[PDB]
Structures are given as C-alpha cells and as structure tokens.
Design a protein around this ligand. Structure first.
Ligand SMILES: Cc1noc(C)c1C(=O)NCCC1=CCCCC1
Ligand SMILES: Cc1noc(C)c1C(=O)NCCC1=CCCCC1
Lengths: 268, 269
C-alpha cells in the first residue's frame, strides 16, 4: 500500500484468505469491512494521524478530542473469491463544521472493474464526556491539507441510499437473535469493540434462508452508542419489502439503542 | 507464499494488520492461529489436496473420508507487532496408521529469529458417520510423496508439553463464561465452525486481570466433538499452578456434552 501520486488518497492490495470466505466461497461482508478499516488506518499512518482507530491530530490529542463513526454505507456488486486480488482506494474530506467523511472504492485488480463502494460520516467528540463538538478551525487546517479540496464522492448521486433517514424498528420484530457478546478477538488496542462486529451483529437476525438464496447488496448503519466489553446485545430484524429489512441493535436488558440500519438483498 | 526448494514444506509471509492486534499493540492468539491455518491451506492447494479445511485426496473423496484436528499445541515466544513481517513455514508428516501431523515454525522476517512454533495431530474419519478409521495404504501413498521421509519435529524434545495427557475439569470451575455462540463470521465454506473460534472460546473464561498482567506462552487443546451453527457453549477454567497454569473445558450449555479440553501456561508481563 501507498499514498497515490498527488498524496490526496491511499491505495492497497489484498489477497482474499481461506478463513475470510463464507458459504459461497466468496469474502464475507465482515472481511470486506475489515479490509476497509485496514486501508483507512494505513492512510492515517501515512499522513501522521493516530493509528488507534480515532485518527487524531496533535491539537485533537491536546484537547482529548477523537473522530467517531456516526454512519456507514456499503454497496457490493461482486464479492471477491478465495485467492482473488482486490485493490482498495480511500480518501477523506471535510464536511464543514459537521465533521469528516471517509470514502472507499473496491476494484478487482485483474479487471480494474469497480466491485464495491463505501462511505462513512465521522463526528468530533470529547473522548471522556462523549459530547459532540462542531469542528473548530485549528483542527480543520491540520487535516484539510490531506483532503482533496474539490468534492470527490464514492456515491455522487443527488440524494441516494447513503443519505436516507433510518426509522426505529417497532416491536414485535419479525426476527431476532438474543444474548450476543463480544469476545477478546472483537476488541481493539484500547479494549473498545471493533466497528465491524456491530455489522455482524446486525446480520445475525437475518434468517438463514435469505442468506442461502440471496447476496447482501447494500447496508446502511447508524452508530448511536458504543457497546462495552461486558455489554450484551439483542439483534432485531423486520422485512420492509429484491428483499429489504429494517434493523435494530439494543442492550439486552433496558433496551438502550446502540445501532439501527437497513439491508437490501438481491436474489442469487 | 510458495513450496520450498525440495517441495517438502511451504513458506508464506504476512504483514500484521491493524484490526489483528489486541491490548499490547501485538497480534492476538486467534490472529496467529488464523495465519497458521491460512499457510496450511495454501500448502494443501500447492500440492493438489482439497482446500475446504479437510485436505482430502482423490481416493479419500471417493470413500467420503476427511482429515479432522484431534489435538493442537502452540508455543509463542514473541507476539508480532502491528506492521511486522512474520514468516511461517509448514509441513505435514505420516504418523503410521494413527493419522497425520502438521507442524509450523513462526519467524520474524527482519531478524530470522524463531518467535513461535506449533504442532497438530489429525485423524481420518468418515465425513457422515464421524467414525474414526485407521489410515489405509491407498491413502498413505497418496500423501507420503508430499511429506519429508525423515522425522522433522517443531517440538523435538524427548518429554515436551505437546504430548501430555489432559484431565477433565471437575465442578465447580473457578471461572466461567456462559452462552457463547458462533456467528456467520466464525463459519467456513461448508457452514462448520472454524477451529480457531474454539481457541477464543477457551480463553474467554480466563480473568481479565491475568490477560492484562500476563502473556499467553503455551496452549494445548483436544478437539473431542464439533460445535454446530445453532449450538451454545460454556467455557470453564480453573487455576492449576512467575508463571500461571490453567485447566480448561468447553461443553454444550445444557446437557454439558464435552467439545474441548485444554491447558494454558502464562508468563508475567
Ligand atoms: C481512518 C482510520 N484510522 O484507523 C482506522 C481503523 C480507520 C478507519 O478507516 N476505520 C473505519 C471504521 C469502519 C470500517 C468498517 C465498518 C464501519 C466502521
Ligand atoms: C491443511 C489445511 N488445509 O486447509 C486448512 C484450513 C488447513 C490447516 O492448516 N488448518 C489448520 C486448522 C487449525 C488452525 C489453528 C488451530 C486449530 C486447528
């Protein structure tokens, strides 16, 4: 992997591993999501930001400020097979005082064809109080020198799937998976649950028949609250429709929301 | 990755990924175990065996026979850091009519120093009845051409940890983690739970204080029964011991049917 010629984006190649594939002999969506966070981390390191998952600058660390994912949107046209070479390109951009955006383009290295794309919105917050801040001015300058100044959107379409409001699932849910817990493998260097684990938890309430007759095409997820090491999650799914579903992750007892999303599935 | 000059072993290099590390900023044991299974699969493919996790030959598929892990033994001296390059060498060997053995050597590519080693015993079995059978001569000849004919042991020692009998944990267990379930990410191409998930489940009943003051040095695990997609596991641990040793047991949540038993040796950090 390396920053491109202009230094305003990063590229990296991956060979799909034997343990990274599911029932269709193709990469799981959790493998794809892990590959996205890997190239995003390598881009953060190549420009001097932190590599702890928060992509902080010098002044952000001085003020105990971090970047947190608020929303994610992934669209996959073709899942890579075992042994395939995928090329991922990533870049970040300023969204005024609202926050940051990180985009990804996935391509098959042999054909150069776009096989997937992703977008994510990030917000600035105090690491201890968790209170959101509007992006100041001294922070915008420390990281805008690494962003293209002209807009560069992985999903350029005027008001598309990545910018639609997600509603709260109403009880009773059609499908559910209860008592989900993260294990040590799901935790990062600072013992926080990996962002990709929440994707897997959402998909656990999808029935096995849908998974065996359909492929996941689009996934939009809102991150409301962080799940701790000792927290237990309930995964809820209801059909809204191709096949579409509405999702909800909440804490096992009290029912405190952690995530809500939508999935669009295509027949095999 | 590629088979070595003599074709009797396989090597592959890996760069440790950001999401593959834990609290120490070093690779988790599940990442190490996944890297071992990856190079083992690439070696199976390089010599024409199946790549479904069973490493079957033509005649084995004709008779519905598969290789299954019976025991695993891993020793780690130094866990690789984020961005480090590790080199893994693997080879398999005939253990007469008992089964096969697969060995691994982990090295830091920059220093060439041995940072870890692993061994595993495999047994032949009918895929459907799950009945273990002695390895026949037809099968023995189809894979012996890929094994070194002289012994090559990752753990050559005359009385080492990889060949010690593991006892069954007696209730009450000192520590426990209940209601563990595999997710879709933990399943292979044929919807079987990945062998590395069982390692992670064993380590879930280790207290967080041990994990934060010690590093895992040795892990020996016996695989008695396969956990299904819809099965729920209970993880049990009791201290047996500068070092700390534990006895482990994985069993089904209800009835308590054993799936695994093992031992871990931890060194002060
Ligand atoms: C920048 C940066 N610095 O460290 C990391 C790690 C990144 C990064 O790109 N993380 C993406 C997080 C994510 C991926 C897939 C699921 C939804 C959330
Ligand atoms: C040969 C072969 N062919 O496909 C695969 C996959 C292998 C392989 O080496 N699997 C190792 C299994 C394992 C890994 C970590 C500890 C527990 C047991």
């Amino acid at each position: 992997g390396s920053l491109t010629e202009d230094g305003l984006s990063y590229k990296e190649k991956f060979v799909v591993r034997s343990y990274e594939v599911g029932s269709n002999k193709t990469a799981t969506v959790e493998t794809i999501a892990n590959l996205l966070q890997e190239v995003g981390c390598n881009h953060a390191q190549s420009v001097g930001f932190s590599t702890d998952g928060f992509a902080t600058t010098t002044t952000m660390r001085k003020l105990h400020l971090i970047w947190v994912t608020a929303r994610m949107h992934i669209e996959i046209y073709k899942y890579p097979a075992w042994g395939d070479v995928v090329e991922i390109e990533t870049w970040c951009q300023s969204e005024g005082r609202i926050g940051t955006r990180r985009d990804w383009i996935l391509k098959d290295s042999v054909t150069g064809e776009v096989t997937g794309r992703a977008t994510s919105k990030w917000v600035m917050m105090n690491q201890d109080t968790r209170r959101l801040q509007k992006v100041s001015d001294d922070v915008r300058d420390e990281y805008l020198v690494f962003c293209p100044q002209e807009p560069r959107l992985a999903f350029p379409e005027e008001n598309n799937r990545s910018l639609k409001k997600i509603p709260k699932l109403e009880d009773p849910a059609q499908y559910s998976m209860i008592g989900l817990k993260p294990r040590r493998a799901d935790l990062d260097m600072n013992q926080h649950v990996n962002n990709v684990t929440y994707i897997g938890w959402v998909l656990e309430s999808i029935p096995q028949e849908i998974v065996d007759t359909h492929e996941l095409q689009v996934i939009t997820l809102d991150y409301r609250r962080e799940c701790q090491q000792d927290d237990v999650v309930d995964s809820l799914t209801t059909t809204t429709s191709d096949s579409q579903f509405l999702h909800l992750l909440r804490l096992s007892g009290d029912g405190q929301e952690i995530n809500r999303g939508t999935t669009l599935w295509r027949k095999k």
